[PDB]
Amino acid sequence: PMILGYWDIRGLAHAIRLLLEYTDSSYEEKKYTMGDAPDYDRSQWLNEKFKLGLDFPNLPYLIDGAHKITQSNAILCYIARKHNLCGETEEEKIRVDILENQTMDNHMQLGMICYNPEFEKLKPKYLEELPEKLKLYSEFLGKRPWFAGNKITFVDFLVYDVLDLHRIFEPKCLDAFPNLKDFISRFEGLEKISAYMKSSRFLPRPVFSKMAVWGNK
Amino acid sequence: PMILGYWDIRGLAHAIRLLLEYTDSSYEEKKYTMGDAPDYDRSQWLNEKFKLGLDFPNLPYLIDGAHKITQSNAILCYIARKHNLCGETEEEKIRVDILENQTMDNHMQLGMICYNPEFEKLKPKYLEELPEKLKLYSEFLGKRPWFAGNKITFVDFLVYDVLDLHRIFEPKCLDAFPNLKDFISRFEGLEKISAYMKSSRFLPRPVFSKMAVWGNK
């Protein structure tokens, strides 16, 4: 079957796993475990990294027969394309593109400070600027059920992950934005998502790798 | 007319300008100038940032009537969609997605060290790992005229920029990869690209902003 390869954590594979579940995809997971400190041994992956037929060897990767895909966003698009979750109208597509790139940006910013050895010192400013970021997603969604419009697309999975990672980081961060909380309920309320979250497959944490200062476990 | 807003440099607007020229698009450019050190005044942009109707205020941005778009890759997709430069077959689309994200990754890596105050110290390792990166693009392209296959797509503009930024950074870096050099000749050899590169509009540098340690001018 289709196979998703990634570290034995949540990370960049989260939205992918969620999408694979929602779309009722047939897949397996090749999990790689990173060694503990001080080495943080990555040989489980490196000893196989160049033996998978990947053009740009990376994690996560998705193998679907002849198709070997890397780059998290690329994997999401590939799956989304099979289930018409890419956006149909021009307005939807524009929203999808912006979010696809916007979410990764916001994701990176969280990861940047969390892996930074000086995490505790940088945290105050990040939390200071966080409401501003969240408000943008809030205003962008508006009264829409989903981010691209009235139908769900793959970017909802990406935004869900960004919003979720933040409620975990700062529990009260979504309180000022009721529509964002409702988005989360509506998403988690999806039949196939609800079922997956209650299963043994669900892996909401560790958020980041063992090398992280926050969310490393 | 359509308007592209960005700093008065090359940066993330390069592939966009090139695409706009190749597609024969009607556009203007709102250039923002950053102040010199030590302040690096960004008020020319900030004083207008939230007055443009952008959902996630950022640079570059593209205003096309009712459409206000941010995120460089989103802008490229928007323009590409109008001129059937997104990829048609499934294999082309997969290549486009991987490259769209891959190029940004490699682009970020260059920018990370170039803006880093310790640029000179980090440079040795980056140059050591550079051949590896370039070889991946080389093998990926193979004997294809363009990166997605036989027809040109918007990712060729992104790969061109990544390759070009590196020949500027390390002149001999593409020597070991003849097909990459041929790709550059073929791209620059495009009639509308050739014409633009010879015009007053062409802005190949500064590569990065004034805050950069390398390519700041």
Ligand SMILES: N[C@@H](CCC(=O)N[C@@H](CS)C(=O)NCC(=O)O)C(=O)O
């Ligand atoms: N932009 C890539 C990032 C991939 C990446 O950075 N993967 C990390 C884990 S978060 C990794 O361990 N890659 C394998 C390697 O470095 O060889 C994506 O979205 O997939």
Ligand SMILES: N[C@@H](CCC(=O)N[C@@H](CS)C(=O)NCC(=O)O)C(=O)O
């Ligand atoms: N991933 C984004 C990055 C956007 C970004 O970082 N833009 C910088 C310049 S390289 C900027 O000055 N943005 C305006 C701002 O921060 O207010 C893209 O590709 O457009």
